[PDB]
Design a protein around this ligand. Structure first.
Ligand SMILES: [Cl-]
Length: 294
């Protein structure tokens, strides 16, 4: 097993380093040569194209921002499909529209290339420490074959259905993450405006029914004025767009997501698109005229 890994960003880079630590041999690529250099310094090899990675690796992980990027890497000129022999597996760990996962899977299947959609959750801290949750769609046999590989980056790896089900699960995930952040922001801004120190609020509630992974990850960032990604608002906008599109296709009911989407549009318009999604707090701060600080 040489394992391909394409996309060495905020999530991808630490994930690849966990695979190296677990003893896997990697051939890596990214648009940033410095990101490649960092991962080769940890033990990886590299190649000049996705096609060349696919020529050398029986399994390839992608960790990319959106469907256009995955489509270019998987299907485009010098892409995976041009180098992959029948039986090669793509594990796309990107968060992309479920329809796009299915489209890319069908295109790869025509060449005999298999695919799992295995997006993740846990944020940069859990990408680093290897305790991500992974949620996967595709064939059970392929899931079972690469469970250990995926588990080397993760605290949990769960099969959720056929191809695309990983990304459907990730849409549900991203609805929860956005709303949990917004809810934290709404509540902390209320308490601050009403004259109670939000750090004492955080300490007081974190152990009860209001406790969450978002609360412990993001309340400190907000109060310390640290909005460095992390996970950019612009990427969360793409995920909510996908969630809303899916909801409108199947007739689900997404009122709170629809509201938080408009908040994120306001944040993007006010220069916060490249901030961590904890910057949802800044929306509330600006409307309530108070800052949530230590
Ligand atoms: Cl997408």
């Amino acid at each position: 097993m040489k394992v391909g890994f394409i996309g060495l960003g905020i999530m991808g880079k630490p994930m690849s380093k966990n695979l190296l630590k677990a003893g896997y041999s990697l051939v890596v690529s990214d648009r940033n040569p410095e990101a490649i250099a960092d991962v080769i310094a940890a033990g990886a090899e590299t190649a000049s194209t996705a096609k060349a990675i696919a020529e050398q690796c029986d399994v390839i992980i992608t960790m990319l921002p959106n469907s256009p990027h995955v489509k270019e890497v998987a299907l485009g000129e010098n892409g995976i499909i041009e180098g992959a022999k029948p039986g090669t597996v793509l594990i796309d760990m990107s968060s992309i529209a479920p329809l796009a996962s299915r489209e890319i899977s069908d295109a790869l299947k025509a060449k005999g290339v298999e695919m799992l959609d295995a997006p993740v959750s846990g944020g940069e801290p859990k990408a680093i420490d290897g305790t991500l949750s992974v949620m996967v769609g595709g064939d059970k046999a392929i899931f079972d074959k690469y469970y250990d590989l995926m588990k080397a980056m993760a605290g949990s790896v769960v099969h959720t259905g056929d191809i695309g089900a990983g990304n459907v699960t990730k849409l549900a995930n991203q609805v929860i993450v956005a709303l949990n952040i917004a809810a934290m922001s709404e509540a902390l801004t209320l308490a601050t405006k009403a004259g109670v120190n939000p750090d004492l609020v955080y300490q007081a509630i974190r152990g009860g029914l209001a406790g969450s992974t978002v609360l412990d990850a993001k309340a400190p960032m907000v109060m310390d004025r640290n909005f460095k990604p992390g996970f950019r608002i612009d990427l969360h906008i793409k995920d909510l767009a996908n969630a809303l599109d899916t909801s409108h296709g199947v007739g689900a009911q997404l009122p709170l997501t629809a509201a938080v989407m408009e908040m994120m549009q306001a944040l993007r318009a006010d220069g916060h698109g490249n901030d961590d999604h904890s910057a949802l707090a800044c929306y509330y701060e600006k409307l309530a005229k108070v800052e949530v600080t230590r």
